[PDB]
Each structure stands twice: as C-alpha cells, then as structure tokens.
Amino acid sequence: MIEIKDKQLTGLRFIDLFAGLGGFRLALESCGAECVYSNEWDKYAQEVYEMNFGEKPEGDITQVNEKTIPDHDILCAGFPAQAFSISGKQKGFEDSRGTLFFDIARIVREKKPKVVFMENVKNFASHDNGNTLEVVKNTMNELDYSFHAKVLNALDYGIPQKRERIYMICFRNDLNIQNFQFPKPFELNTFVKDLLLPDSEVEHLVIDRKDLVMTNQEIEQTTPKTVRLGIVGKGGQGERIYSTRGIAITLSAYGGGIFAKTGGYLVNGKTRKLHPRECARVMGYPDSYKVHPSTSQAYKQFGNSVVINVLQYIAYNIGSSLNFKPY
DNA sequence: GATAGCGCTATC
DNA sequence: TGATAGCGCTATC
Ligand SMILES: Nc1ncnc2c1ncn2[C@@H]1O[C@H](CSCC[C@H](N)C(=O)O)[C@@H](O)[C@H]1O
C-alpha cells in the first residue's frame, strides 16, 4: 500500500461491510478516516480481522437491524461475487449469495450516508446483458445518490496483478459532488519477481509434475501483463504457469487446480504456487499485516479481498471532491 | 475444512 | 476465430 500525507478523509467515519480481511479499512484509514463498525460473518475471517484490528466483525448482515448501524459518512462494501463472476454459474440475483446488494440498499436508506463505496468483479458490469448493474444504478439513483461506476485494472495502479474490478462510488445528492474522478492510470514499475520471497522460504510450495508441459519461453524483460509459460494436466484453472517477469493472474477464493487460488509461477527453473504472503503483497498488503494461520483460509481471504493500493487512490479522490466546498 | 480436476464463459 | 485465461464448483477423504 501507498503512504499518504494529505489525509483527505480526516474526521470522517466509515462502515466496513463484508470486511473479510479489512482491506477497505486499511485504505480509508490511511486517508485519515475512522472505522466505526464492521460486518463479516465468516469465522476465520473474523479471526484475522480481530488479529489485525482488535474488534470482531458482526454476524449475518441480512439479519442486522439497520437502525442499529452506527452513524457514518462513507459506507464501504465489496459484496459477494460468486453469483456474478465470469468464473461461475451466473445465477445472479437468483443465487442466495447474490442478494446482498439489496441488504446494502436498506442500510443506505436508513443511515443515508454521504458516500457509498462498492466493489465487485468486472463481469458484474455486463452480467445478464447489463440489467444487474442497471438495477444497482437505479436503486442508488432512486435512493437519491449519483452513480459513478468504472472498471480499473490493478496493473494500472502500481500493483502487478491482472485484476480488473468494477468500482462504484456514490455521493448523496445534497452535496453537489461534480468533480469526482477515478484515478488516472500510470506506469507499472513493479513486477511479480520483485514481490517474491527468498527460495529459502518457498521450497515447500514447489510442485514437480511429469505432466508439466512447457509452451512458451521465459521472458527476460518485464511486462505490464500476465505471460503464460507452461501448463500442467489439462491446463485448467490453477494448472497454468506464468512468468514472474510479467504480472500475476487474479487470486481467487474457492479456486482449484494444483496451484489453487494463486496460479503457478516459474522461479529459478522451478514451478510453484505463491505463498500466503506473496499473495498479501500481490494484493497490496503491507508486510506488517498478520495473515490467518490456516494457509487455506489465508489464500481464500486474499482471494476475494481487494487491492489496497487501488482503493487508496479512489478513497483519496473521494475526499478530494468532498473537501472542495468554495464560497 | 483442505485438496485438486474441472468445464464453462466471457473477450477479442 | 483460437488462445487466454476467471473474488468459481464441486467430489472425495
Ligand atoms: N450475509 C453476510 N454477512 C456477512 N458477511 C458476508 C455475508 N455474505 C457474504 N459475506 C462475506 O462477504 C465477503 C465478500 S469478499 C469482500 C472482501 C473484502 N473487501 C476484503 O478486502 O477482504 C466474504 O468475506 C464473505 O464471507
């Protein structure tokens, strides 16, 4: 994550819904905002959240009386996506895990926050031809908020990962927020190879497999893109190998394949999966953040998490706009 | 709870 | 197209 000196969000209070690892907190907090409430029903996730922020998130948001949610200026929420991902049964709103947005809508209706910050996968935009997004746009407009949606890729904001996500920023209409913008992209000056751990610490993750084919030669020069070198087995999800000289593929939560949730990378003639912390970094997390003890849960957590760095640039601009109140 | 084979589907 | 991908889904122990 990036260090920020102009705390645009100072004095503001925010809510951390669907917290998971707490990435949204890390972001807004770096900009001077204050976290007043957090919600996350997964046991193990609460464990890491606690492990890193003291408190322990509250349970099932679908059964929390919104009247109970603390006063707050910005509502943060990266809601479930198994329901809209390019990688699943796009059952959208029909899927139980795909209704959570409306839970948000009723948190917003009651607490009427100044800003509504949401995150989800790229597919969300076009899912169901584009009606799902539309339902969210109108629901927000009908709640009297503006709707600023755009998809950004992590590799355009200082982090080596081809992770494209849809970011939705909502300002209450009262305030005439009309100068808000999404961070402009910029040169990628860091690659997988730069975030790795010494072989001394990865040995255990190396996977030698006879069925390891090799369809592309290692690259010498770094690229702001993921480059597939080899493959194992049938070459499906988590069976693909990439050049650490480029950028990492998207991390996933319920992912499979021998290189489950991280993907295979070629390091010094060997083929292996990333380390819980190599992920942490790949996701923009400061090495000072304590990961969950259960490696599996760890990978799962960073899987649906958010790239801290990205949220920062957005969070910064949210404040920039909020703080512009001329006479 | 931890593993791992997979079987579509975005997109260009 | 033909090649690459994906906050996923499942079964098995
Ligand atoms: N009803 C519910 N109540 C609380 N959390 C829920 C929930 N349904 C899903 N979730 C949680 O939704 C989260 C979506 S992933 C969001 C990740 C988060 N922005 C981060 O940075 O870690 C998951 O952690 C999942 O456990």
Side-chain angles (χ1 to χ4, degrees), chain A residues 101-176:
Chain A
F101 173 70
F102 300 120
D103 268 271
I104 294 177
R106 51 160 267 270
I107 280 274
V108 175
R109 195 180 320 94
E110 238 281 9
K111 297 293 303 177
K112 284 297 154 58
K114 292 178 160 53
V115 187
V116 163
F117 191 12
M118 291 168 292
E119 175 272 331
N120 210 290
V121 297
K122 165 150 144 281
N123 198 219
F124 200 75
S126 64
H127 172 81
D128 190 27
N129 294 112
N131 307 337
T132 28
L133 181 50
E134 191 164 58
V135 167
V136 166
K137 181 182 196 310
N138 304 322
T139 299
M140 288 304 118
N141 293 311
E142 297 177 66
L143 276 171
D144 192 58
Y145 284 80
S146 62
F147 197 68
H148 298 277
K150 188 188 187 66
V151 176
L152 311 195
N153 184 33
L155 65 67
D156 275 301
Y157 301 97
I159 297 303
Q161 185 184 186
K162 185 194 66 63
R163 169 172 282 223
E164 315 169 75
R165 293 287 184 278
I166 179 70
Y167 297 96
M168 303 165 275
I169 331 294
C170 315
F171 292 97
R172 222 200 305 118
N173 286 313
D174 328 39
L175 350 157
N176 280 252

Coordinates of all heavy atoms in Angstrom, one line a residue, chain A residues 101-176:
Chain A
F101 N -26.6 -7.1 -2.1 CA -26.6 -5.7 -2.5 C -27.8 -5.0 -1.9 O -27.7 -3.9 -1.4 CB -26.6 -5.5 -4.0 CG -26.8 -4.1 -4.4 CD1 -25.8 -3.2 -4.2 CD2 -28.0 -3.7 -5.0 CE1 -26.0 -1.8 -4.5 CE2 -28.2 -2.3 -5.3 CZ -27.2 -1.4 -5.1
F102 N -29.0 -5.7 -2.0 CA -30.2 -5.1 -1.5 C -30.1 -4.9 0.0 O -30.8 -4.0 0.5 CB -31.4 -5.9 -2.0 CG -31.5 -6.0 -3.5 CD1 -31.4 -7.2 -4.1 CD2 -31.6 -4.8 -4.3 CE1 -31.4 -7.3 -5.5 CE2 -31.6 -4.9 -5.6 CZ -31.5 -6.1 -6.3
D103 N -29.3 -5.7 0.6 CA -29.2 -5.5 2.1 C -28.5 -4.2 2.2 O -28.9 -3.4 3.1 CB -28.3 -6.6 2.7 CG -29.1 -7.8 3.1 OD1 -29.5 -7.8 4.3 OD2 -29.3 -8.8 2.3
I104 N -27.5 -3.9 1.4 CA -26.8 -2.6 1.4 C -27.8 -1.5 1.2 O -27.9 -0.5 2.0 CB -25.7 -2.5 0.3 CG1 -24.6 -3.5 0.5 CG2 -25.2 -1.1 0.3 CD1 -23.6 -3.5 -0.6
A105 N -28.6 -1.6 0.2 CA -29.6 -0.6 -0.2 C -30.4 -0.2 1.0 O -30.8 1.0 1.2 CB -30.4 -1.1 -1.3
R106 N -30.8 -1.2 1.9 CA -31.6 -0.8 3.0 C -30.7 -0.3 4.2 O -31.3 0.1 5.2 CB -32.5 -2.0 3.5 CG -31.8 -3.3 3.7 CD -32.6 -4.2 4.5 NE -32.2 -4.1 5.9 CZ -31.3 -4.9 6.5 NH1 -30.7 -5.8 5.8 NH2 -31.0 -4.7 7.8
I107 N -29.4 -0.4 4.1 CA -28.6 0.1 5.1 C -28.5 1.6 4.8 O -28.6 2.4 5.6 CB -27.2 -0.5 5.1 CG1 -27.1 -1.9 5.8 CG2 -26.2 0.4 5.9 CD1 -27.0 -1.9 7.3
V108 N -28.3 1.8 3.5 CA -28.2 3.2 2.9 C -29.5 3.9 3.2 O -29.5 5.1 3.6 CB -27.9 3.1 1.4 CG1 -27.9 4.6 0.9 CG2 -26.6 2.5 1.2
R109 N -30.7 3.3 2.9 CA -31.9 4.0 3.0 C -32.1 4.6 4.5 O -32.6 5.7 4.6 CB -33.1 3.1 2.7 CG -34.4 3.7 2.5 CD -35.5 2.8 2.2 NE -35.1 1.7 1.3 CZ -34.6 0.5 1.7 NH1 -34.6 0.2 3.0 NH2 -34.2 -0.4 0.8
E110 N -31.7 3.8 5.5 CA -31.9 4.2 6.8 C -30.8 5.2 7.4 O -31.2 6.2 7.9 CB -31.9 3.0 7.8 CG -33.1 2.8 8.6 CD -33.1 3.7 9.8 OE1 -32.2 4.6 9.9 OE2 -34.0 3.6 10.7
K111 N -29.6 4.9 7.1 CA -28.5 5.7 7.6 C -28.1 6.9 6.7 O -27.3 7.7 7.0 CB -27.3 4.8 7.9 CG -27.5 3.8 9.0 CD -27.7 4.5 10.3 CE -26.5 5.4 10.7 NZ -26.6 6.2 11.9
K112 N -28.7 6.9 5.4 CA -28.4 7.9 4.5 C -27.0 8.5 4.6 O -26.8 9.7 4.9 CB -29.4 9.1 4.6 CG -30.7 8.7 4.0 CD -30.6 8.5 2.4 CE -31.8 7.6 2.0 NZ -33.1 8.1 2.3
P113 N -25.9 7.7 4.3 CA -24.5 8.2 4.4 C -24.1 9.1 3.2 O -24.8 9.2 2.2 CB -23.7 6.9 4.3 CG -24.6 6.0 3.4 CD -26.0 6.3 3.9
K114 N -23.1 9.9 3.5 CA -22.6 10.9 2.5 C -22.0 10.2 1.2 O -22.2 10.7 0.1 CB -21.6 11.8 3.1 CG -22.2 12.8 4.2 CD -21.2 13.7 4.9 CE -22.0 14.9 5.6 NZ -23.1 14.7 6.6
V115 N -21.3 9.1 1.4 CA -20.7 8.4 0.3 C -20.9 6.8 0.4 O -20.8 6.2 1.4 CB -19.2 8.6 0.2 CG1 -18.7 8.0 -1.0 CG2 -18.9 10.1 0.3
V116 N -21.2 6.2 -0.8 CA -21.4 4.8 -0.8 C -20.4 4.3 -1.8 O -20.4 4.5 -3.0 CB -22.8 4.4 -1.3 CG1 -22.9 3.0 -1.8 CG2 -23.8 4.6 -0.2
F117 N -19.4 3.5 -1.2 CA -18.3 3.0 -1.9 C -18.4 1.4 -2.1 O -18.5 0.7 -1.0 CB -17.0 3.3 -1.2 CG -15.7 3.1 -1.9 CD1 -15.7 2.7 -3.3 CD2 -14.5 3.1 -1.3 CE1 -14.5 2.5 -3.9 CE2 -13.3 2.9 -1.9 CZ -13.3 2.6 -3.3
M118 N -18.6 0.9 -3.3 CA -18.7 -0.5 -3.5 C -17.7 -1.1 -4.5 O -17.2 -0.4 -5.4 CB -20.1 -0.8 -4.0 CG -21.2 -0.6 -2.9 SD -22.9 -0.7 -3.5 CE -22.9 0.8 -4.4
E119 N -17.5 -2.4 -4.4 CA -16.5 -3.1 -5.2 C -17.1 -4.5 -5.6 O -17.8 -5.1 -4.8 CB -15.2 -3.2 -4.5 CG -14.1 -4.0 -5.3 CD -14.1 -5.5 -4.9 OE1 -14.6 -5.8 -3.8 OE2 -13.7 -6.3 -5.7
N120 N -16.7 -4.9 -6.8 CA -17.1 -6.2 -7.3 C -16.3 -6.6 -8.6 O -15.6 -5.7 -9.1 CB -18.7 -6.3 -7.6 CG -19.2 -7.7 -7.4 OD1 -19.0 -8.6 -8.2 ND2 -20.0 -7.9 -6.4
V121 N -16.5 -7.8 -9.1 CA -15.7 -8.2 -10.3 C -16.2 -7.6 -11.6 O -17.3 -7.0 -11.6 CB -15.8 -9.8 -10.5 CG1 -15.2 -10.4 -9.3 CG2 -17.3 -10.2 -10.6
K122 N -15.4 -7.6 -12.6 CA -15.7 -7.0 -13.9 C -16.9 -7.5 -14.5 O -17.7 -6.7 -15.1 CB -14.5 -7.2 -14.8 CG -14.8 -6.9 -16.3 CD -13.5 -6.4 -17.0 CE -13.4 -6.9 -18.5 NZ -12.9 -8.3 -18.5
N123 N -17.1 -8.8 -14.4 CA -18.3 -9.4 -15.1 C -19.6 -8.7 -14.6 O -20.5 -8.6 -15.3 CB -18.4 -10.8 -14.8 CG -19.4 -11.5 -15.7 OD1 -20.1 -12.4 -15.3 ND2 -19.3 -11.1 -17.0
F124 N -19.5 -8.2 -13.3 CA -20.7 -7.5 -12.7 C -21.3 -6.5 -13.7 O -22.5 -6.4 -13.8 CB -20.4 -6.8 -11.4 CG -21.6 -6.6 -10.6 CD1 -22.2 -7.6 -9.8 CD2 -22.0 -5.3 -10.4 CE1 -23.2 -7.3 -9.0 CE2 -23.1 -5.0 -9.6 CZ -23.7 -6.0 -8.9
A125 N -20.4 -5.8 -14.4 CA -20.9 -4.7 -15.3 C -21.9 -5.3 -16.3 O -23.0 -4.9 -16.4 CB -19.7 -4.1 -15.9
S126 N -21.4 -6.2 -17.1 CA -22.2 -6.8 -18.2 C -23.1 -8.0 -17.8 O -24.0 -8.4 -18.6 CB -21.3 -7.3 -19.4 OG -20.5 -8.3 -18.9
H127 N -22.9 -8.5 -16.6 CA -23.8 -9.7 -16.2 C -25.3 -9.5 -16.6 O -25.8 -8.5 -16.4 CB -23.7 -9.9 -14.7 CG -24.7 -10.9 -14.1 ND1 -24.4 -12.2 -14.2 CD2 -25.9 -10.7 -13.6 CE1 -25.4 -12.9 -13.6 NE2 -26.3 -12.0 -13.3
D128 N -25.8 -10.6 -17.1 CA -27.2 -10.5 -17.5 C -27.5 -9.4 -18.5 O -28.4 -8.6 -18.3 CB -28.1 -10.4 -16.3 CG -29.6 -10.6 -16.5 OD1 -29.9 -11.3 -17.5 OD2 -30.4 -10.0 -15.8
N129 N -26.7 -9.3 -19.6 CA -26.7 -8.3 -20.6 C -26.4 -6.9 -20.0 O -26.0 -6.0 -20.7 CB -28.1 -8.3 -21.2 CG -28.4 -9.5 -22.1 OD1 -29.2 -10.4 -21.7 ND2 -27.6 -9.7 -23.2
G130 N -26.6 -6.7 -18.7 CA -26.4 -5.5 -18.1 C -27.5 -5.0 -17.2 O -27.5 -3.8 -16.9
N131 N -28.4 -5.9 -16.9 CA -29.5 -5.5 -16.1 C -29.2 -5.4 -14.6 O -29.7 -4.5 -13.9 CB -30.7 -6.5 -16.3 CG -31.1 -6.7 -17.7 OD1 -30.8 -5.8 -18.6 ND2 -31.7 -7.8 -18.1
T132 N -28.3 -6.3 -14.2 CA -27.9 -6.3 -12.8 C -27.3 -5.0 -12.4 O -27.7 -4.4 -11.4 CB -26.9 -7.4 -12.5 OG1 -26.2 -7.7 -13.7 CG2 -27.6 -8.7 -12.1
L133 N -26.4 -4.5 -13.2 CA -25.7 -3.2 -12.9 C -26.8 -2.1 -12.9 O -26.9 -1.3 -12.0 CB -24.7 -2.9 -13.9 CG -23.9 -1.6 -13.8 CD1 -23.3 -1.4 -12.3 CD2 -22.8 -1.5 -14.8
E134 N -27.7 -2.2 -13.9 CA -28.8 -1.2 -14.0 C -29.7 -1.2 -12.8 O -30.1 -0.2 -12.4 CB -29.6 -1.6 -15.3 CG -30.6 -0.6 -15.8 CD -31.1 -0.8 -17.2 OE1 -31.6 -1.9 -17.5 OE2 -30.9 0.1 -18.0
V135 N -29.9 -2.4 -12.2 CA -30.8 -2.4 -11.0 C -30.1 -1.7 -9.9 O -30.7 -1.0 -9.1 CB -31.0 -3.9 -10.6 CG1 -31.7 -3.9 -9.2 CG2 -32.0 -4.5 -11.5
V136 N -28.7 -1.8 -9.9 CA -28.0 -1.1 -8.9 C -27.9 0.4 -9.1 O -28.1 1.2 -8.2 CB -26.5 -1.7 -8.8 CG1 -25.6 -0.8 -8.0 CG2 -26.5 -3.1 -8.1
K137 N -27.8 0.8 -10.4 CA -27.7 2.2 -10.7 C -29.0 2.9 -10.3 O -29.0 3.8 -9.5 CB -27.6 2.4 -12.2 CG -27.5 3.9 -12.6 CD -27.4 4.1 -14.1 CE -27.0 5.6 -14.4 NZ -27.7 6.6 -13.7
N138 N -30.2 2.3 -10.8 CA -31.4 2.9 -10.4 C -31.7 2.9 -8.9 O -32.2 3.9 -8.4 CB -32.5 2.2 -11.3 CG -32.3 2.3 -12.8 OD1 -31.8 3.3 -13.3 ND2 -32.6 1.2 -13.5
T139 N -31.4 1.8 -8.3 CA -31.7 1.6 -6.8 C -30.9 2.7 -6.1 O -31.4 3.3 -5.1 CB -31.2 0.3 -6.3 OG1 -31.9 -0.8 -7.0 CG2 -31.4 0.2 -4.8
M140 N -29.7 3.1 -6.6 CA -29.0 4.1 -6.0 C -29.5 5.5 -6.4 O -29.5 6.4 -5.5 CB -27.5 4.0 -6.4 CG -26.7 2.9 -5.8 SD -26.8 2.9 -4.0 CE -27.6 1.4 -3.7
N141 N -29.9 5.7 -7.6 CA -30.5 6.9 -8.1 C -31.8 7.1 -7.4 O -32.1 8.2 -6.9 CB -30.7 6.9 -9.6 CG -29.5 6.8 -10.4 OD1 -28.5 7.6 -10.2 ND2 -29.5 5.9 -11.4
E142 N -32.5 6.1 -7.2 CA -33.8 6.1 -6.5 C -33.7 6.3 -5.0 O -34.7 6.5 -4.3 CB -34.6 4.9 -6.9 CG -34.9 4.8 -8.4 CD -35.6 3.5 -8.8 OE1 -36.8 3.4 -8.4 OE2 -35.0 2.7 -9.6
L143 N -32.4 6.2 -4.5 CA -32.2 6.5 -3.1 C -31.6 7.9 -3.0 O -31.3 8.4 -1.9 CB -31.1 5.5 -2.6 CG -31.5 4.1 -2.2 CD1 -30.3 3.2 -1.9 CD2 -32.4 4.1 -0.9
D144 N -31.6 8.5 -4.2 CA -31.1 9.9 -4.3 C -29.6 10.1 -4.3 O -29.1 11.0 -3.6 CB -31.8 10.8 -3.3 CG -31.6 12.3 -3.6 OD1 -31.9 12.8 -4.7 OD2 -31.0 13.0 -2.7
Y145 N -28.9 9.2 -4.9 CA -27.4 9.3 -5.0 C -27.0 9.2 -6.4 O -27.7 8.7 -7.3 CB -26.8 8.1 -4.2 CG -26.8 8.1 -2.7 CD1 -28.0 7.8 -2.0 CD2 -25.7 8.5 -2.0 CE1 -28.0 7.7 -0.6 CE2 -25.7 8.4 -0.6 CZ -26.8 8.1 0.1 OH -26.8 8.0 1.5
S146 N -25.8 9.8 -6.7 CA -25.3 9.8 -8.0 C -24.6 8.4 -8.2 O -24.4 7.7 -7.2 CB -24.2 10.9 -8.2 OG -23.1 10.7 -7.4
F147 N -24.3 8.1 -9.4 CA -23.7 6.7 -9.7 C -22.5 6.8 -10.6 O -22.6 7.1 -11.7 CB -24.7 5.8 -10.4 CG -24.4 4.4 -10.3 CD1 -24.4 3.7 -9.1 CD2 -24.0 3.7 -11.4 CE1 -24.1 2.3 -9.0 CE2 -23.7 2.3 -11.3 CZ -23.7 1.6 -10.1
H148 N -21.3 6.6 -10.0 CA -20.1 6.7 -10.7 C -19.5 5.3 -10.8 O -18.8 4.9 -9.8 CB -19.1 7.7 -10.0 CG -19.6 9.1 -10.0 ND1 -19.5 10.0 -11.0 CD2 -20.3 9.8 -9.0 CE1 -20.0 11.1 -10.7 NE2 -20.5 11.0 -9.5
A149 N -19.7 4.6 -11.9 CA -19.1 3.2 -12.0 C -18.0 3.1 -13.1 O -18.2 3.7 -14.1 CB -20.2 2.2 -12.3
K150 N -17.0 2.4 -12.8 CA -15.9 2.2 -13.8 C -15.1 1.0 -13.4 O -14.9 0.7 -12.2 CB -15.0 3.5 -13.8 CG -14.0 3.5 -14.9 CD -13.0 4.7 -14.7 CE -12.1 4.8 -15.9 NZ -12.8 5.2 -17.1
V151 N -14.5 0.3 -14.4 CA -13.7 -0.8 -14.1 C -12.2 -0.5 -14.3 O -11.9 0.1 -15.3 CB -14.0 -2.0 -15.1 CG1 -13.1 -3.2 -14.8 CG2 -15.5 -2.5 -14.9
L152 N -11.4 -0.7 -13.3 CA -10.0 -0.5 -13.3 C -9.2 -1.8 -13.2 O -9.7 -2.7 -12.6 CB -9.6 0.5 -12.2 CG -10.3 1.7 -11.9 CD1 -9.4 2.6 -11.0 CD2 -10.7 2.5 -13.2
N153 N -8.0 -1.8 -13.7 CA -7.2 -3.0 -13.6 C -6.1 -2.6 -12.6 O -5.6 -1.5 -12.7 CB -6.7 -3.4 -14.9 CG -5.9 -4.7 -14.9 OD1 -6.2 -5.6 -14.1 ND2 -4.9 -4.8 -15.7
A154 N -5.8 -3.6 -11.7 CA -4.7 -3.3 -10.7 C -3.4 -2.9 -11.3 O -2.7 -2.0 -10.8 CB -4.6 -4.6 -9.9
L155 N -3.0 -3.5 -12.4 CA -1.7 -3.3 -13.1 C -1.6 -1.8 -13.6 O -0.5 -1.4 -14.1 CB -1.4 -4.3 -14.2 CG -2.4 -4.2 -15.4 CD1 -2.2 -2.9 -16.2 CD2 -2.1 -5.4 -16.3
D156 N -2.6 -1.0 -13.4 CA -2.6 0.4 -13.9 C -2.4 1.3 -12.7 O -2.4 2.5 -12.8 CB -3.9 0.7 -14.6 CG -3.9 0.3 -16.0 OD1 -3.0 0.9 -16.7 OD2 -4.8 -0.5 -16.5
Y157 N -2.3 0.7 -11.5 CA -2.1 1.5 -10.3 C -1.0 1.0 -9.4 O -1.1 0.9 -8.2 CB -3.4 1.6 -9.5 CG -4.5 2.2 -10.4 CD1 -5.4 1.4 -11.1 CD2 -4.5 3.6 -10.6 CE1 -6.3 2.0 -12.0 CE2 -5.4 4.2 -11.5 CZ -6.3 3.4 -12.2 OH -7.2 4.0 -13.0
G158 N 0.2 0.6 -10.0 CA 1.3 0.2 -9.2 C 1.4 -1.2 -8.6 O 2.3 -1.5 -7.9
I159 N 0.4 -2.0 -8.9 CA 0.4 -3.4 -8.4 C 0.4 -4.4 -9.5 O -0.4 -4.3 -10.4 CB -0.8 -3.7 -7.5 CG1 -0.8 -2.7 -6.3 CG2 -0.9 -5.1 -7.1 CD1 0.5 -2.9 -5.4
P160 N 1.4 -5.4 -9.5 CA 1.5 -6.4 -10.5 C 0.5 -7.5 -10.4 O 0.8 -8.6 -9.9 CB 2.9 -6.9 -10.4 CG 3.1 -6.8 -8.9 CD 2.6 -5.4 -8.6
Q161 N -0.7 -7.3 -10.9 CA -1.8 -8.3 -10.9 C -2.8 -7.9 -11.9 O -3.3 -6.8 -11.9 CB -2.4 -8.4 -9.5 CG -3.5 -9.6 -9.5 CD -4.2 -9.7 -8.1 OE1 -5.0 -10.6 -7.9 NE2 -4.0 -8.7 -7.2
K162 N -3.2 -8.8 -12.8 CA -4.2 -8.5 -13.8 C -5.6 -8.7 -13.2 O -6.4 -9.5 -13.7 CB -4.1 -9.5 -15.0 CG -5.1 -9.1 -16.2 CD -5.2 -10.2 -17.2 CE -5.8 -11.4 -16.6 NZ -7.2 -11.2 -16.1
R163 N -5.9 -7.9 -12.2 CA -7.2 -8.0 -11.5 C -8.0 -6.8 -11.9 O -7.8 -5.6 -11.4 CB -6.9 -8.0 -10.0 CG -8.2 -7.9 -9.2 CD -8.0 -8.1 -7.8 NE -8.0 -9.5 -7.5 CZ -8.6 -10.1 -6.4 NH1 -9.3 -9.3 -5.6 NH2 -8.5 -11.4 -6.2
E164 N -9.0 -7.0 -12.7 CA -10.0 -6.0 -13.2 C -11.2 -6.0 -12.3 O -11.9 -7.1 -12.3 CB -10.4 -6.2 -14.6 CG -9.2 -6.6 -15.6 CD -9.7 -7.0 -16.9 OE1 -10.2 -6.2 -17.7 OE2 -9.7 -8.3 -17.2
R165 N -11.5 -4.9 -11.7 CA -12.7 -4.9 -10.8 C -13.6 -3.6 -11.1 O -13.1 -2.6 -11.5 CB -12.3 -4.9 -9.3 CG -11.6 -6.2 -8.9 CD -12.7 -7.3 -8.8 NE -12.2 -8.6 -8.3 CZ -11.7 -9.5 -9.1 NH1 -11.5 -9.3 -10.4 NH2 -11.4 -10.7 -8.6
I166 N -14.9 -3.7 -10.8 CA -15.8 -2.6 -11.0 C -16.0 -1.9 -9.7 O -16.3 -2.4 -8.7 CB -17.3 -3.2 -11.4 CG1 -18.2 -2.0 -11.6 CG2 -17.8 -4.1 -10.4 CD1 -18.0 -1.1 -12.8
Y167 N -15.7 -0.6 -9.8 CA -15.7 0.3 -8.6 C -16.9 1.3 -8.7 O -17.1 2.0 -9.7 CB -14.4 1.0 -8.5 CG -13.3 0.1 -8.2 CD1 -12.4 -0.3 -9.2 CD2 -13.0 -0.4 -6.9 CE1 -11.4 -1.2 -9.0 CE2 -12.0 -1.3 -6.7 CZ -11.2 -1.7 -7.7 OH -10.1 -2.6 -7.5
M168 N -17.8 1.2 -7.7 CA -19.0 2.1 -7.7 C -18.9 3.1 -6.5 O -19.0 2.7 -5.4 CB -20.2 1.2 -7.6 CG -20.3 0.2 -8.8 SD -21.5 -1.1 -8.6 CE -20.5 -2.3 -7.7
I169 N -18.8 4.4 -6.9 CA -18.8 5.5 -5.9 C -20.1 6.3 -6.0 O -20.5 6.8 -7.0 CB -17.6 6.4 -6.3 CG1 -16.5 5.7 -7.0 CG2 -17.1 7.1 -5.0 CD1 -15.8 4.7 -6.1
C170 N -20.7 6.4 -4.8 CA -22.0 7.1 -4.7 C -22.0 8.3 -3.7 O -21.7 8.1 -2.5 CB -23.1 6.2 -4.4 SG -23.1 4.6 -5.2
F171 N -22.3 9.5 -4.2 CA -22.4 10.7 -3.3 C -23.8 11.0 -3.1 O -24.6 11.0 -4.1 CB -21.7 11.8 -4.0 CG -20.2 11.6 -4.1 CD1 -19.6 11.1 -5.3 CD2 -19.4 11.9 -3.1 CE1 -18.3 10.9 -5.4 CE2 -18.0 11.7 -3.1 CZ -17.5 11.2 -4.3
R172 N -24.2 11.4 -1.9 CA -25.6 11.8 -1.7 C -25.8 13.1 -2.5 O -24.9 13.9 -2.6 CB -25.8 12.1 -0.2 CG -27.1 11.6 0.4 CD -27.5 12.3 1.7 NE -26.5 12.4 2.7 CZ -26.0 13.5 3.2 NH1 -26.3 14.7 2.7 NH2 -25.1 13.4 4.2
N173 N -27.0 13.2 -3.1 CA -27.3 14.4 -4.0 C -27.2 15.8 -3.3 O -26.8 16.8 -4.0 CB -28.6 14.2 -4.7 CG -28.6 13.2 -5.8 OD1 -27.7 13.3 -6.7 ND2 -29.6 12.3 -5.9
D174 N -27.5 15.9 -2.0 CA -27.4 17.2 -1.3 C -26.2 17.9 -1.8 O -26.2 18.9 -2.4 CB -27.3 16.9 0.2 CG -27.9 15.7 0.7 OD1 -27.9 14.7 0.0 OD2 -28.5 15.7 1.9
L175 N -25.0 17.3 -1.4 CA -23.7 17.8 -1.8 C -23.7 17.7 -3.3 O -24.0 16.7 -3.9 CB -22.6 16.9 -1.2 CG -23.1 15.8 -0.2 CD1 -22.2 14.6 -0.2 CD2 -23.3 16.5 1.1
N176 N -23.3 18.8 -4.0 CA -23.2 18.8 -5.4 C -21.9 18.3 -5.9 O -21.1 19.0 -6.6 CB -23.5 20.2 -6.0 CG -24.9 20.5 -6.0 OD1 -25.5 20.6 -7.1 ND2 -25.5 20.7 -4.8

